[PDB]
């Protein structure tokens, strides 16, 4: 059965640090422990080691990007801009 109603992984904090601060940290906590898609190879096997460092279980490849997610939204825009300027 389901073990908590609202707080999944923040349940280790008990009743301490306040509802809103716990809520904001939960979104980033879930992201930094999930498995992200690897463009090299084809597997969902990217795991964060340290802040900004991601390693693929299958590829055994290391990529630099994002404190809590593999790719930041600002990075996606920059790649498109650079590609467009190169094609000029």
């Amino acid at each position: 059965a389901k073990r908590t109603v609202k707080m999944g992984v923040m349940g280790r904090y008990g009743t301490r640090y306040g509802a809103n601060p716990r809520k904001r940290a939960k979104k980033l906590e879930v992201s930094q422990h999930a498995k992200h898609f690897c463009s090299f190879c084809g597997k969902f096997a990217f795991r964060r080691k340290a802040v900004g460092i991601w390693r693929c279980d299958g590829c055994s490849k290391t990529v630099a990007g994002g404190a809590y997610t593999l790719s930041t939204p600002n990075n996606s825009t920059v790649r498109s801009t650079v590609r467009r300027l190169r094609e000029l």
């Binding site: 980033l28 802040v51 900004g52 460092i53 630099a64 994002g66 404190a67 809590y68 650079v82 300027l85």
Partner: protein, 255 residues
């Protein structure tokens, strides 16, 4: 009275950098003949974390231009760099993420990082995680380039200065609340002896200008002159304004 803590920190002593675990300074390649006239190609070998720094570092291997040996460089890694990637540095390098080009060869409106303030300085601007600079315009007659800095200010630099294409990796660090005193303890362990902080009004008059009184209060305005001597220049130093900011926030810094 006795010496204030801010003045005491200037002696060094127990307030210096904790640098035993650090890998060394991070910098670009040396601006040499090959970089000035052609290009050099290197290979990214590893991506690592350094204590006290939020951005990831990259080790890049090149061939020595004059001798039979290999050269290893430690640089601040832009987002998206991966092991096994090829990096081109020099005048004739193509425009791609991770390459290092002179500013005069980069199209206007581009996003850059690790920018040299002066030619050959090996990178001094836009180095913290998630930061970048924007190219505004070129001046071919004067041979200069205009840049917008992360703080919002605008600066003109010689077009010979180099820059790396992309943004610094590790962005989004400060969006997560810390929630615990121990987390701050571990955060500052890798940096220096500056935490926790004791309020000035909680000290005694012998140590701080704000100390003393039968209530915790400052008895005089906390805005102090630019000409105040050390030991008196505490509080809000040479403030142009105070209070909550209404409307747009102005750009900080000098004229």
């Amino acid at each position: 009275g006795k010496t204030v803590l801010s003045c005491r920190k200037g002696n060094g002593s127990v307030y210096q950098v904790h640098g035993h675990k650090r890998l060394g300074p991070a910098k670009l390649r040396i601006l040499d003949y090959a970089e000035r006239h052609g290009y050099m190609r290197g290979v990214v070998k590893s991506i690592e974390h350094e204590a006290g720094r939020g951005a990831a570092l990259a080790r890049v291997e090149f061939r020595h231009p004059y001798k039979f040996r290999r050269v290893k460089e430690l640089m601040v890694a832009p987002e998206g760099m991966f092991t096994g990637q090829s990096v081109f540095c020099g005048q004739k390098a193509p425009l791609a993420i991770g390459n290092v080009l002179p500013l005069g060869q980069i199209t206007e409106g581009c996003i850059v990082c690790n920018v040299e303030a002066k030619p050959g300085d090996r990178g001094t601007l836009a180095r913290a995680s998630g930061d970048y600079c924007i190219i505004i315009s070129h001046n071919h007659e004067t041979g200069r380039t205009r840049l917008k800095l992360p703080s919002g200010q605008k600066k003109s630099v010689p077009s010979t200065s180099r820059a790396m294409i992309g943004i610094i990796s590790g962005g989004g660090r400060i969006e997560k609340p810390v929630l615990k005193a121990g987390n701050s303890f571990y955060r500052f362990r890798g940096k220096r002896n500056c935490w926790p902080k004791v309020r000035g009004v909680a000290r005694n008059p012998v140590e701080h200008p704000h100390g003393g009184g039968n209530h915790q209060h400052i008895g005089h305005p906390s805005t102090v002159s630019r000409h105040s001597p050390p030991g008196q220049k505490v509080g809000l130093i040479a403030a142009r304004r105070t209070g909550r900011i209404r409307g747009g926030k102005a750009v900080k810094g000098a004229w």
